Design a protein around this ligand. Structure first.
Ligand SMILES: CCCCCCC/C=C\CCCCCC(=O)OC[C@@H](O)CO
Ligand SMILES: CCCCCCC/C=C\CCCCCC(=O)OC[C@@H](O)CO
Ligand SMILES: CCCCCCC/C=C\CCCCCC(=O)OC[C@@H](O)CO
Ligand SMILES: CCCCCCC/C=C\CCCCCC(=O)OC[C@@H](O)CO
Ligand SMILES: CCCCCCC/C=C\CCCCCC(=O)OC[C@@H](O)CO
Ligand SMILES: CCCCCCC/C=C\CCCCCC(=O)OC[C@@H](O)CO
Ligand SMILES: CCCCCCC/C=C\CCCCCC(=O)OC[C@@H](O)CO
Ligand SMILES: CCCCCCC/C=C\CCCCCC(=O)OC[C@@H](O)CO
Length: 200
C-alpha cells in the first residue's frame, strides 16, 4: 500500500530527466554536445560546472530520497528498499516523461547506496577518485567504482535483497556505458585535463 506508492513515486521521480530540463531552460540540446548524454558530466560540458554540480545533486537526490524513506520505513533488509532503489535508477535510465531515453544511473545509484550505507558510498567514490585521477576518464572510473560498490556490499555482509538490488543496478549501469566502452577501446573517449596544464 504505502510501499507500492513509494515504488511508483521512486520511478516517476526518477523519470524526471533533470539534465534535459535544465538544458531546455538554457536553450541547449544536450544530444548535440559532447557525448550527447543527459547526465551531470555532459551537462558540465554544455552549461558549465555550476549546472553540472546542480544536476549531479538532483540526480543523486532522485535515488537518495526514496531509498532513505524505504530504509527508515521498512528496513535495509526489506525488498521494498530493493524495489525503490531499482525504480529510481530504472526511472532515471528509462524515463516515462522523456521517451524512455535517460541517463546512465551513476549519480542516482550513488544516492541509493548512500541511503543504505554512507561508508560503502564513500569507499566507492574513493575508488572512483583514484581511477579518475589516474586515467582521466569519467566512464572508466564509474565502471570500476560500480563493480567495487557491489564487492563492498557483498563483502560487508549485506543481505540478498540488497545484493539483488546492487547486481541489477550495476549490470544496467555498465550496459548503459557500452558506448563509452567502445570509445575507450578505440581511443576516442573524451579525456579530461591534457591541455589545461598550459594555463596552470
Ligand atoms: C517494468 C517492470 C515492472 C516490474 C515491477 C513490478 C512491481 C515491483 C515491486 C513491487 C512494488 C512494491 C510493493 C511492496 C509492498 O507493498 O511491500 C510492503 C508490504 O508488503 C509490507 O511491507
Ligand atoms: C561518508 C561521507 C562521504 C561520502 C561520499 C559520497 C559521495 C559524495 C560526494 C561526491 C560527489 C561530488 C559532487 C560533484 C560532482 O561529481 O559533480 C558531477 C560533475 O559532473 C560536475 O562536473
Ligand atoms: C590526494 C588528494 C586526493 C583527492 C581529493 C579529493 C576530494 C574529494 C572530492 C572532490 C570533488 C570532486 C567530485 C567529482 C568531480 O567533480 O569529478 C570531476 C569532474 O570534473 C569529471 O567530469
Ligand atoms: C513522498 C516523498 C516526497 C518527498 C519527501 C522528501 C523527504 C526526504 C527526507 C526526509 C525523510 C524522513 C524519514 C522518512 C521515514 O521513512 O521515516 C520513518 C521513520 O523514521 C519514522 O516513522
Ligand atoms: C522492477 C522494480 C520496480 C521498478 C519498475 C520501473 C519500470 C522499469 C523499467 C521501465 C521500462 C523498461 C525499459 C525497456 C527498454 O529498455 O526499452 C528500450 C528503451 O531503450 C526505449 O527505447
Ligand atoms: C552496484 C551499485 C553501484 C551504485 C554506485 C555506482 C557508482 C559509485 C561511485 C561513483 C560515484 C562518482 C560520482 C562522480 C561523478 O562524476 O559521477 C558521474 C557523473 O556523471 C554523475 O552521474
Ligand atoms: C582499471 C581496471 C578497471 C576494471 C573495470 C573496467 C573495465 C571495463 C571497461 C574498460 C574497457 C577498456 C579499458 C580502459 C581503456 O582502454 O582505457 C584507455 C587506455 O588505453 C588508457 O587510458
Ligand atoms: C544479473 C543480470 C542483470 C541484467 C540487467 C541488464 C544487464 C545487461 C548487460 C550485462 C552487463 C554487460 C555490460 C558490458 C558490455 O556489454 O559492454 C560491452 C560493449 O562494448 C558491447 O558493445
Amino acid at each position: 500500500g504505502s510501499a507500492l506508492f513509494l515504488v511508483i513515486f521512486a520511478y516517476l521521480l526518477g523519470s524526471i530527466t533533470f539534465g534535459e530540463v535544465i538544458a531546455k531552460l538554457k536553450g541547449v540540446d544536450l544530444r548535440n554536445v559532447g557525448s550527447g548524454n543527459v547526465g551531470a558530466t555532459n551537462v558540465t560540458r554544455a552549461l558549465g560546472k555550476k549546472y553540472g554540480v546542480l544536476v549531479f545533486f538532483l540526480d543523486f537526490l532522485k535515488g537518495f530520497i526514496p531509498a532513505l524513506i524505504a530504509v527508515k520505513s521498512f528496513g535495509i533488509d526489506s525488498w521494498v528498499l530493493t524495489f525503490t532503489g531499482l525504480a529510481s535508477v530504472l526511472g532515471h535510465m528509462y524515463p516515462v516523461f522523456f521517451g524512455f531515453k535517460g541517463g546512465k544511473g551513476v549519480a542516482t545509484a550513488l544516492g541509493v547506496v548512500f541511503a543504505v550505507s554512507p561508508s560503502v558510498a564513500l569507499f566507492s567514490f574513493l575508488v572512483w577518485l583514484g581511477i579518475f585521477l589516474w586515467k582521466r576518464y569519467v566512464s572508466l572510473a564509474s565502471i570500476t567504482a560500480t563493480i567495487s560498490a557491489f564487492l563492498f556490499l557483498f563483502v560487508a555482509g549485506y543481505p540478498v535483497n540488497v545484493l539483488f538490488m546492487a547486481i541489477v543496478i550495476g549490470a544496467l549501469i555498465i550496459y548503459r556505458h557500452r558506448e563509452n566502452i567502445n570509445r575507450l577501446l578505440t581511443g576516442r573517449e573524451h579525456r579530461f585535463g591534457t591541455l589545461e596544464v598550459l594555463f596552470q
